[PDB]
């Protein structure tokens, strides 16, 4: 979406997370914004001694290269359970004689 999502002044809207204490299980949405505690001293909820905000903005600009421009990703996952399986898929038809 380099044509659209890249604005000249900088699309400072969206966020990445880069520091986390541990990994995450598949398929859960975590919205924790607590300051990462890299050092042994407490963060006290503010940036400081080995303490930084885990979320930083994209800061996209049109000048960015192909490998840095925004990309929209959609993941479709199918789940089959003990249900009559409503969503099936299209069925064709032909003229009758």
């Amino acid at each position: 979406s380099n044509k659209l999502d890249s604005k000249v002044s900088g699309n400072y809207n969206y966020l990445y997370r880069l520091f986390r204490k541990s990994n995450l299980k598949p398929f859960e949405r975590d919205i924790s914004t607590e300051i990462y505690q890299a050092g042994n001293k407490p963060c006290n909820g503010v940036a400081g001694f080995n303490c930084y905000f885990p979320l930083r903005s994209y800061s996209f600009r049109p000048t960015y290269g192909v490998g840095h421009q925004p990309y929209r990703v959609v993941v479709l996952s199918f789940e089959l359970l003990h249900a009559p399986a409503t969503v099936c898929g299209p069925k064709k038809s032909t003229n009758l004689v």
């Binding site: 990462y36 080995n50 930084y52 600009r61």
Partner: protein, 596 residues
């Protein structure tokens, strides 16, 4: 918890916001280099202000971070390049008057105007004046007068200022826990921690001096040739046993001898290789020559480039109201933003230079995946070297003939190639004399081995015996020769150009035996050399995570610099110089002076 994790977190952050800040700073820079407007000056200033402020804050807070208990051998480089105590050790007032004294000295250099006698109106800034007089006139009196005026009106003003600045730099170096400021710059080459591949701060002194001594006969024959040409031109002003005049070398500092090429050419009947009229005939522009060089890089297997190159970088002179610099430079705006600045003109020099900065583009691209403080070469001399290797390799007439610049009917001749070799000797070999002179001179000056009252006199002895340059007009301690140089007016290490000159020939030879070239080294091309292209990629893909000694061992297998390629590439030139000088005196005397 251990400190290594804290260091990793901090360095990752530092990379993040540092690359961000550098991105917008370079965006403003590429704004300015194409438009001259005041708010652009303002926002460059304040963006650099945040740059410096946050860098200083991070460096100060990381100064407390030690080095003993941090492993991985690469974070160590990050810490070493991030600590950077520098001049911040001393008091704030000391930094203040250091800043103002550097401002005053740089302004004095820039605002050094030479006014003609008996008319204080037609003053010259050396930008519109002597720069063309030296290259288009051969007047002894005018050159001598301008030389004396430049070394008198300028150096006398800041000779005590130069002494004070040198004392201040040595004092801050001593407070930096180094023996002297020369060692302070030598610390950039400090390499340790890996067995066998270490490098000391005194090894460079020894091997450079030994290599200079080995090369010395080549300079002796070159100086004899130049002196013989000088008697052929001015037999009434140069002694056959004395030293050459200072203002007859080709330039004021003795750096370039190319200005005498048209005077020192033995075979002027045969023109050199110049196909600018050819490309004018096909009406080639910057776009066409750049596509030519693009597929030339393709031929060595190097990949194409993205769109931002050509819908972001503008490659002409804007003229009209938009004012831009015409000094061609490749700008690394950071994080996939690569641009080129050049005013397009029809010239072979512009052709080779354009090859030069686009090779630099690939150079900077090579280490695009490294952490922020690692986006440079293992050393600094690799830069303008790797930039120029491909241009010099393509300078061979075979490459020009293949791509249509040179007609197939043009048979290669020994005279033109010997003329090219002599042009090289006057251009590239001529940089070494002033290089080692100034460089060793500053190493002995900053070591405290030269008395203050006998400084200027101490400048002359080796100048009369090593480089063989005798002053047309005697100079006392009032004069200040180094103050006349621009490259020291901004306080940069001059070793860079010597490293480039000595590394380059080794590089093209390495490429040649990588390409299995057969025959003379001066008839070797890097076209269709994809294996050497990928090997060079492997060489440049490291960055600043390993010693440059390992890079030299990777390219050819040597942990110490080799001067054999320099001799093998000029064996024909050496033989021709010997043949030419076999009927002329060899050597010079250090006692003769033109002023008696």
């Amino acid at each position: 918890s251990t400190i290594e994790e804290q260091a990793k977190t901090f360095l990752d952050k530092f990379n993040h916001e540092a690359e961000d800040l550098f991105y917008q700073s370079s965006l403003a820079s590429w704004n300015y280099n194409t438009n001259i407007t005041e708010e652009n000056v303002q926002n460059m200033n304040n963006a650099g202000d945040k740059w410096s402020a946050f860098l200083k804050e991070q460096s100060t807070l990381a100064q407390m971070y030690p080095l003993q208990e941090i492993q991985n051998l690469t974070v160590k480089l990050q810490l070493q390049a991030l600590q950077q105590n520098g001049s911040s050790v001393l008091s704030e007032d000391k930094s203040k008057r250091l800043n103002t004294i550097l401002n005053t000295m740089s302004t004095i250099y820039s605002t050094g105007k030479v006014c003609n006698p008996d008319n204080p109106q037609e003053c010259l800034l050396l930008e519109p004046g002597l720069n063309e007089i030296m290259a288009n006139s051969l007047d002894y009196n005018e050159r001598l007068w301008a030389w004396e005026s430049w070394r008198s009106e300028v150096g006398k003003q800041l000779r005590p200022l130069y002494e004070e600045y040198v004392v201040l730099k040595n004092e801050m170096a001593r407070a930096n826990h180094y023996e002297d400021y020369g060692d302070y710059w030598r610390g950039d080459y400090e390499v340790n921690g890996v067995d066998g591949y270490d490098y000391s701060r005194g090894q460079l002194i020894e091997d450079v001096e030994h290599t200079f001594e080995e090369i010395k006969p080549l300079y002796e024959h070159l100086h004899a040739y130049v002196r013989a040409k000088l008697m052929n031109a001015y037999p009434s002003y140069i002694s056959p046993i004395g030293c050459l005049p200072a203002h007859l070398l080709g330039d004021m500092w003795g750096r370039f001898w190319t200005n005498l090429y048209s005077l020192t050419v033995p075979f002027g009947q045969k023109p050199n290789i110049d196909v600018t009229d050819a490309m004018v005939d096909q009406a080639w522009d910057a776009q066409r020559i750049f596509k030519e060089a693009e597929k030339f890089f393709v031929s060595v297997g190097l990949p194409n480039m993205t769109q931002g190159f050509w819908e972001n970088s503008m490659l002409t002179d804007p003229g009209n109201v938009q004012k831009a610099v015409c000094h061609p430079t490749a700008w690394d705006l950071g994080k996939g933003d690569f641009r080129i600045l050049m005013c397009t003109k029809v010239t072979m020099d512009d052709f080779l230079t354009a090859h030069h900065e686009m090779g630099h583009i690939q150079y900077d691209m090579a280490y695009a995946a490294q952490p922020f403080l690692l986006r440079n070469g293992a050393n600094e001399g690799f830069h303008e070297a790797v930039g120029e290797i491909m241009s010099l390799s393509a300078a061979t007439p075979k490459h020009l003939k293949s791509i249509g610049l040179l007609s197939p009917d043009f048979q290669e001749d020994n005279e033109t190639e010997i003329n090219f070799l002599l042009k090289q000797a006057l251009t590239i070999v001529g940089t070494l004399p002033f290089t080692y002179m100034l460089e060793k001179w500053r190493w002995m000056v900053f070591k405290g081995e030269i008395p203050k009252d006998q400084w200027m006199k101490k400048w002359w002895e080796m100048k009369r015996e090593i480089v063989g340059v005798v002053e047309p007009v005697p100079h006392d301690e009032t004069y200040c020769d180094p103050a006349s140089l621009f490259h020291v007016s901004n306080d940069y290490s001059f070793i860079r150009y010597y490293t480039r000159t000595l590394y380059q020939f080794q590089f093209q030879e390495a490429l040649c035996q990588a390409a299995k070239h057969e025959g003379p080294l001066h008839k070797c091309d890097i076209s269709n050399s994809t294996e050497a292209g990928q090997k060079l990629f492997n060489m440049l893909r490291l960055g600043k995570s390993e010693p440059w000694t390992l890079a030299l061992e990777n390219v050819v297998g040597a942990k110490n610099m080799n001067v054999r390629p320099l001799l093998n590439y000029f064996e024909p030139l050496f033989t021709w110089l010997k043949d030419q000088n076999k009927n002329s005196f060899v050597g010079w005397s250090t006692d003769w002076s033109p002023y008696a």
